[PDB]
Design a protein around this nucleic acid. Sequence first.
RNA 1: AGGGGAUCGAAGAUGAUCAGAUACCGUCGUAGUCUUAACCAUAAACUAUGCCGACUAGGGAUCGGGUGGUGUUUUGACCCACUCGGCACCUUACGAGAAAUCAAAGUCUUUGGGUUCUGGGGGGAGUAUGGUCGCAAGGCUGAAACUUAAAGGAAUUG
RNA 2: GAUGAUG
Lengths: 87, 48, 121, 206, 97, 25, 129, 216
Amino acid sequence: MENDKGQLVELYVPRKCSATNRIIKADDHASVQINVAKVDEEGRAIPGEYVTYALSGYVRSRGESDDSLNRLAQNDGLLKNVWSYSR
Amino acid sequence: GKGKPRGLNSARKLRVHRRNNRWAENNYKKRLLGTAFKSSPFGGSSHA
Amino acid sequence: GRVRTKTVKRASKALIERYYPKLTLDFQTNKRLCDEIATIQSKRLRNKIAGYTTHLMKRIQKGPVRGISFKLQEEERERKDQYVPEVSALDLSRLNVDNQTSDLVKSLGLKLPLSVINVSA
Amino acid sequence: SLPATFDLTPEDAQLLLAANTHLGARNVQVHQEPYVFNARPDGVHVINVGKTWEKLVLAARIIAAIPNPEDVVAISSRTFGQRAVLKFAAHTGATPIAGRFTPGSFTNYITRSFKEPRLVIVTDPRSDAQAIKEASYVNIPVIALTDLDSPSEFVDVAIPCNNRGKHSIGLIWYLLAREVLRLRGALVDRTQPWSIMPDLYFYRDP
Amino acid sequence: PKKRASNGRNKKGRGHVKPVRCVNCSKSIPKDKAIKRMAIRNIVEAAAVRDLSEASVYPEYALPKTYNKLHYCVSCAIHARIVRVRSREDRKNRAPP
Amino acid sequence: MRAKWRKKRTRRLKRKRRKVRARSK
Amino acid sequence: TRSSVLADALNAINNAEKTGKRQVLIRPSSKVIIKFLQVMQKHGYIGEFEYIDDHRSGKIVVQLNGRLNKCGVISPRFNVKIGDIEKWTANLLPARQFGYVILTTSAGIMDHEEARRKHVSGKILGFVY
Amino acid sequence: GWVPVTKLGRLVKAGKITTIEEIFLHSLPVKEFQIIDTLLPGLQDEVMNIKPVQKQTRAGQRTRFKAVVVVGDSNGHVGLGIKTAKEVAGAIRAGIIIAKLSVIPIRRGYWGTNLGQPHSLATKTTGKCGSVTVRLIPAPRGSGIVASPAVKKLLQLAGVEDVYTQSNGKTRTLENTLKAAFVAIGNTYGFLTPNLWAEQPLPVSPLDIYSDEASA
RNA sequence: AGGGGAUCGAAGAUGAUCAGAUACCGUCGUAGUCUUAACCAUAAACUAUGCCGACUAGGGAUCGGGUGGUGUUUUGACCCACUCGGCACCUUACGAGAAAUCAAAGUCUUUGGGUUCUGGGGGGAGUAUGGUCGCAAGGCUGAAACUUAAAGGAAUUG
RNA sequence: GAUGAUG
């Protein structure tokens, strides 16, 4: 949100849930952020290097968190045959 | 829906319905009955 | 009634966890130890403290008492926690699986020594 | 993407089939349906051990991302998992919670049990419900060993396994310990098995 | 307020349920609301079973039994200590003792 | 008083107004 | 009975969008339903959708994203003058920089700021913001 | 003095967190009131009202006092807190602390063209506590805060210059009206306007990039 | 108005209790209770919740019909899975509510799917009066003068 | 499962 001459006039731009695309407010305390370690050629983690995901409080409360992480992970190569689109 | 008509051609029912219920109000009831002139000792005057 | 208050219960507990090797079943011996190992304000309370410490000592001879632990006891415990049998119970002593369990192995593509047995409701 | 050596080996498949990590519950809830393979007569539902393994490595990779090993907390209120937890923490650097879980460990900051981890692992979401509930107030991710009927709310990475058996719970904890150490390099080679028998994790109550 | 979702009776999907009479006070109460107990006892009390065996002409005679089903109104069920006032959370329980 | 018995009283009162007034018909 | 098919379609989208779903199935389909969903799609609020033929007035499946906040109809389809559009947007839009009121006109189904460009007006249908 | 107990307080004291916007962005829990006054040094507090409450006993009425307190920067930060205590002074003193731990961010936008600085809210918002529902609508410049005295103060301390308000329900229970306004004003950052539709990489938590300093 | 009239039993008659007891308790007992013909039109007639339609969470039990399993004991009865239509029930709060609580009492200040009926502080009053229906008891329709600062709903500590 | 009104 800019003013008439291209200056951002916003306190901060919040994150968004990866599973549902909603805003993670300042006090969404069910919300979490997972870090998944990348693996080097030899087969051992590369410190500080992550594939990061966010899930909102709503998603986790309904019980969909596990399922929606399977989908995101597979789309990023971190799983092979866990999630099927044609349920 | 809520308990009133909503059609484009429902104006008649919404007029009549409101007219009937206005009588539950005290100001409307006393004014149109004309109880000021009929019964009030001052007969609607501010002083006597 | 001869119930003992928390001041007595905890002072006695605090002495066993530090002085098991030096404590004994004798009341007269324990009574004299508690003069040199604690600062208590009265003969009456000292006698009660030493009395209940003796009482717990008899208990420990019969077995572990809940909520009191001391060096000698725990060291034996951890040794019993390092146990590991001669051979794993999971080892293939001869593995039996159902028809549906066999179908799973085929789907994954693994080679195993299956033996198939039937089942019913 | 992971290399080809992370795939399921027949040696492992023997362990998973030997401890009956595949014999699940007679009733399955909707969220766990993907993990089912087929239905045996008598109602037992076989679990797809392939997804048990893949979910075990993925969980293992989240643990390895925590900078400090002490900020991983392992819980097991029920007995069949208490020995396992006390040994997961020993081999890795986790903080175990075996036995009673005092309400307010994660939300009350003047209690002697105060911990603020970056990840919690639990053995049974139905009996360790307090830890899951308290996690949701302070933004702590959760990993839970899950049966086909166990509840999944406020759980992020569920590892499907048969949790009604002594050997099954022990084995899953053992393999998380193994995979984590290999990732961190404490074990040099993935091809050679671990020198600690998995039965070190199993329960004993004579 | 509404004290119970069952309205203190087992009637759903019916208009009427025929009445029954209480076994103490004779007061009428719909069958579905009455408190019902099935009492069964030996015809000879425990103290007398021995003396009756000695007197029995027949050898190995099996003791008969008495069967009756008893209907109580709410007032007489409270008094006889057949049911008792119960706490709010404890009211929802359906299982026998 | 109880609603039922107040209703009764008004009924046994109307029944009497209804007949005293019948004397003038 | 089923009085408005556009009302049911927009209610199903709303219900699923609030429960985090990524797609819906709306039955039955209609010309006004497609044209409504084409204005929403143009402004980025739904994404792709597909029409299934079944010889029986048909079905649709609509992909969703998190963008949509609310969508719905105004019933009855009131008459709107060209000076009355400013009193409808003011009532049922969050702020006057984003949001649309979709209204059927002689030019076709459109949104209000297109109706200003083209200088047309007609019956109001619904809103999307 | 102050000796931090939580991880976040340790980083904040060390200076490795600089702006309160990082805490909001990652939605970290704030449990020590010193974290707030070390990052928002300009907060000012106004005490709304003090009311007595009573419970009966064998020997009469036990009486305590209940205070409402609002803390704010007047530049986009407000907090609301309530506490009951045996002394009026202790109620106010504890009311300021609870108020600080509940600071939330506000969003401000334009009524019309984006000329100059933000002055009002970006979108209509509603909040409810008990029966009282408060609604906030953007207003042009020069309108001011058109609200009752109590709700007006809390909107001044969040930095809103021009805003309309409408209310429904039993407003005279001031605790609910102020708590309903607080929900309405904090909801402004949950509304996904179309200028936020762009995708941003998720930042790495400060609690993870400064792990060493957090533990000690 | 005929028939029937055993039991129970407004009225009524009696014994006891009591300061009184034209009440509760014990014993009698007419109308009634049952049926045919013809009236009456009311109830806490209650789920204190109008009807048609679409959509939104988990678990199991049961009633009726149908499909698959040549399932298993002797077409039928059972058993496993599935499905349509019912009476309901257990857990939860995305949601609703002043709360009790609610899978509808949700998808309502982000207020519009169609439609019908009723309410406007407590009393006077469901009263007076005029119509209309009934053999009668009464039913439907239904005010005003005047009086009043509180009546009331759900929860909380005593 | 006898009696027990009022301030």
